[PDB]
Design an enzyme around this catalytic site. Structure first.
Site, PDB file in Angstrom:
ATOM      1  CG  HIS A  76      56.772  48.703  13.235  1.00 27.27           C
ATOM      2  ND1 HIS A  76      56.588  49.731  14.034  1.00 27.27           N
ATOM      3  CD2 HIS A  76      57.352  47.780  13.714  1.00 27.27           C
ATOM      4  CE1 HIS A  76      56.698  49.232  15.322  1.00 27.27           C
ATOM      5  NE2 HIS A  76      57.545  47.933  15.006  1.00 27.27           N
ATOM      6  CG  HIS A 125      59.808  47.226   4.129  1.00 27.66           C
ATOM      7  ND1 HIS A 125      60.897  46.702   4.196  1.00 27.66           N
ATOM      8  CD2 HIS A 125      59.770  48.603   4.350  1.00 27.66           C
ATOM      9  CE1 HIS A 125      61.799  47.790   4.399  1.00 27.66           C
ATOM     10  NE2 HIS A 125      61.004  48.855   4.337  1.00 27.66           N
ATOM     11  CG  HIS A 165      58.574  53.259   4.301  1.00 26.89           C
ATOM     12  ND1 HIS A 165      58.743  53.049   5.371  1.00 26.89           N
ATOM     13  CD2 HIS A 165      59.663  52.467   3.799  1.00 26.89           C
ATOM     14  CE1 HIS A 165      59.711  52.319   5.723  1.00 26.89           C
ATOM     15  NE2 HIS A 165      60.244  51.990   4.612  1.00 26.89           N
ATOM     16  CD  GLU A 202      60.939  55.545   5.142  1.00 26.70           C
ATOM     17  OE1 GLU A 202      61.804  54.614   4.700  1.00 26.70           O
ATOM     18  OE2 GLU A 202      60.826  55.991   5.967  1.00 26.70           O
ATOM     19  CG  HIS A 228      62.785  50.898   1.444  1.00 26.58           C
ATOM     20  ND1 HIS A 228      62.557  51.698   2.777  1.00 26.58           N
ATOM     21  CD2 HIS A 228      62.929  51.833   0.435  1.00 26.58           C
ATOM     22  CE1 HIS A 228      62.599  52.854   2.343  1.00 26.58           C
ATOM     23  NE2 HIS A 228      63.025  53.075   1.207  1.00 26.58           N
ATOM     24  CB  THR A 239      64.202  54.807   7.050  1.00 27.29           C
ATOM     25  OG1 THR A 239      63.471  53.748   6.868  1.00 27.29           O
ATOM     26  CG2 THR A 239      65.175  55.185   5.886  1.00 27.29           C
TER      27      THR A 239
HETATM   28  N1  V1F Z   1      63.684  51.534   5.514  1.00 25.01           N
HETATM   29  S1  V1F Z   1      64.554  50.132   5.807  1.00 25.01           S
HETATM   30  O1  V1F Z   1      64.871  49.459   4.349  1.00 25.01           O
HETATM   31  O2  V1F Z   1      65.812  50.512   6.398  1.00 25.01           O
HETATM   32  C1  V1F Z   1      63.759  48.815   6.677  1.00 25.01           C
HETATM   33  C2  V1F Z   1      62.310  49.019   7.521  1.00 25.01           C
HETATM   34  F1  V1F Z   1      61.689  50.206   7.133  1.00 25.01           F
HETATM   35  C3  V1F Z   1      61.903  47.990   8.266  1.00 25.01           C
HETATM   36  F2  V1F Z   1      60.606  48.206   8.619  1.00 25.01           F
HETATM   37  C4  V1F Z   1      62.485  46.911   8.247  1.00 25.01           C
HETATM   38  S2  V1F Z   1      61.755  45.713   9.572  1.00 25.01           S
HETATM   39  O3  V1F Z   1      60.407  45.099   8.818  1.00 25.01           O
HETATM   40  O4  V1F Z   1      62.519  44.168   9.487  1.00 25.01           O
HETATM   41  C5  V1F Z   1      61.358  45.766  11.111  1.00 25.01           C
HETATM   42  C6  V1F Z   1      62.333  46.663  11.857  1.00 25.01           C
HETATM   43  C7  V1F Z   1      63.637  46.251  12.328  1.00 25.01           C
HETATM   44  C8  V1F Z   1      64.825  46.607  11.606  1.00 25.01           C
HETATM   45  C9  V1F Z   1      66.210  45.600  11.704  1.00 25.01           C
HETATM   46  C10 V1F Z   1      66.151  44.847  12.596  1.00 25.01           C
HETATM   47  C11 V1F Z   1      64.980  44.487  13.578  1.00 25.01           C
HETATM   48  C12 V1F Z   1      63.787  45.412  13.252  1.00 25.01           C
HETATM   49  C13 V1F Z   1      63.806  46.716   8.149  1.00 25.01           C
HETATM   50  N2  V1F Z   1      64.348  45.812   8.222  1.00 25.01           N
HETATM   51  C14 V1F Z   1      65.950  45.250   7.792  1.00 25.01           C
HETATM   52  C15 V1F Z   1      66.446  43.927   8.300  1.00 25.01           C
HETATM   53  C16 V1F Z   1      65.684  42.760   7.858  1.00 25.01           C
HETATM   54  C17 V1F Z   1      66.091  41.411   8.085  1.00 25.01           C
HETATM   55  C18 V1F Z   1      67.053  41.230   9.175  1.00 25.01           C
HETATM   56  C19 V1F Z   1      67.727  42.428   9.962  1.00 25.01           C
HETATM   57  C20 V1F Z   1      67.214  43.714   9.455  1.00 25.01           C
HETATM   58  C21 V1F Z   1      64.451  47.680   7.255  1.00 25.01           C
HETATM   59  F3  V1F Z   1      65.562  47.582   6.732  1.00 25.01           F
HETATM   60 ZN    ZN Z   2      61.933  50.726   4.401  1.00 24.74          ZN
END
Ligand code: V1F
Ligand code: ZN
Ligand code: V1F
Ligand code: ZN
Lengths: 260, 261
Positions: free
Chosen positions: B64, B89, B91, B102, B115, B196
């Site tokens: 993603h 990470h 976007h 975003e 972010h 998001t």
């Molecule tokens: N826009 S964002 O800052 O809110 C964001 C992302 F865009 C994103 F892609 C992620 S992800 O890599 O971790 C995969 C999606 C996800 C999000 C939350 C839980 C499971 C899967 C997190 N992740 C925040 C996060 C980091 C560590 C532990 C829990 C959540 C995430 F917070």
């Molecule tokens: Zn993000």
């Protein structure tokens, strides 16, 4: 029923109305990266827009907007089929943030937006039938901003208190609907898209005029405060505000312009 | 599963992830009608951001985005609690419309957005637990525009070719993460919002810095063209592009700013 806020708001529409998460969704942000001048686009011609003052046309609060019913003898030329009118209605924001057009131009929201909805009467008997069929619908969109008082828009706005609640209706005398259109209607953006509410059918040819019209701050505030989404007897009344959909992704799709 | 395009795209996230259709969603458009200056918004203090150049940090394509794992000794102080970093990470858009931040500002999309995700380590044991809890997360957002080459973002971007596909990993030597932050970090927008991406939990305290950083057109095009959502083995590959969510309605809510204009 679907709404524009809370649990049944726009990010949930696709739960009950799959097309709201399908192809060709509208509205969009009109910005240079996705525009292409198309020299073959021609000016639309508005026929039958000047409605007889001796006739009357139903204004209805449908719980989502206020709509004015329009006769099928009103029509547009300049598209490949004749499209005949069925209704017009509006989208707006709220008094704390009076920026509720549906389309945006270079990221900017206008105060409000008028849609004049037509169906392909060459192919289809009525709008209802046209609405979920190929080439079914053509909508004209006029962007609206703050400025001088608009006596034409007032031919709709002055009746708002008779349609405050969902299901309420009032007849309005005919007037010239061309007066709601901006300057230089020859300049417009044109693209294939969808209904911007459920059921979000991807069956709309959009034309959004380049130039906005003006209404006064008092007119805009009246439109923003007059109406409720709910029936007169709803235990939980909801004001009709922010009834516009967020702009959609528009990837690989192109918007054609009649101006360069 | 979920994507940014097609039937699994953002208008359908709420089908599997009910919070995506709930309240307090991000990202939003930051525009004057919804801004209010709040003088109590103090400078965040970045601590442990100057990461050890003897240490390496895991970079992953999770299908993603591309994410860099961060150590819990990195944190921001300033908040009611200490928030500890967990990952960062990005976007972005695509080369035909390179506008994939975003958050937007007065309707301006930026080229990209960084972010840096933190969790309230004072109240919670890890970010998983914290992500379901009110204000359990704090995310710092940096808007990125196309302009000058950025040697610090290139510490990450130089690794993109070892993480082209879902599940692939690369190590990145530590560098000072403060260098990914823009000028005058004291100046920021602050609001209560959500992840998001799914599961869209409304648990995030947002800090979006007022000033963007720049990366080069080459860096931006590498970010837009290098990565795939799909595994290496996949005969039908999908480009990782336009991985940003559309702005959300933001009514009855205000965004507070630490700068006045
Ligand atoms: N826009 S964002 O800052 O809110 C964001 C992302 F865009 C994103 F892609 C992620 S992800 O890599 O971790 C995969 C999606 C996800 C999000 C939350 C839980 C499971 C899967 C997190 N992740 C925040 C996060 C980091 C560590 C532990 C829990 C959540 C995430 F917070
Ligand atoms: Zn993000
Ligand atoms: N904003 S819009 O112009 O795209 C729009 C819709 F998005 C839409 F869903 C509809 S409808 O199918 O729900 C009918 C009711 C309606 C009216 C005004 C605002 C929202 C909904 C209409 N209406 C046009 C129409 C007329 C007859 C048959 C089908 C559609 C409509 F005009
Ligand atoms: Zn409409």
């Amino acid at each position: 029923k679907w709404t524009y806020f809370g649990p049944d708001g726009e990010n949930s529409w696709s739960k009950k109305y799959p097309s709201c998460g399908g192809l060709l969704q509208s509205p969009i942000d009109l910005h240079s990266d996705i525009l292409q001048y198309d020299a073959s686009l021609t000016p639309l011609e508005f026929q039958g827009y000047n409605l007889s003052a001796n006739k009357q046309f139903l204004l209805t609060n449908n719980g989502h907007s206020v709509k004015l019913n329009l006769p099928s003898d009103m029509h547009i030329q300049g598209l490949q089929s004749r499209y005949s009118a069925t209704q017009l209605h509006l989208h707006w924001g709220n008094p704390n943030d009076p920026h509720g057009s549906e389309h945006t131009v270079s990221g900017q929201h206008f105060a409000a937006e008028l849609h004049i909805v037509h169906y392909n009467s060459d192919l289809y008997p009525d709008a209802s039938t046209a609405s979920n069929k190929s080439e079914g619908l053509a909508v004209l969109a006029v962007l609206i901003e703050m400025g001088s008082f608009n006596p034409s828009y007032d031919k709709i706005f002055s009746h708002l208190q008779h349609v405050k609640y969902k299901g309420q209706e009032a007849f309005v005398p005919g007037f010239n609907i061309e007066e709601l259109l901006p300057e230089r209607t020859a300049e417009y953006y044109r693209y294939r898209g969808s209904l911007t509410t459920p059921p979000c059918n991807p069956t709309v040819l959009w034309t959004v005029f380049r130039n906005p019209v003006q209404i006064s701050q008092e007119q805009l505030l009246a439109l923003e405060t007059a109406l409720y989404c709910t029936h007169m007897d709803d235990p939980s009344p909801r004001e009709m505000i922010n009834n516009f959909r967020q702009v959609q992704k528009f990837d690989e799709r192109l918007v054609y312009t009649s101006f360069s």
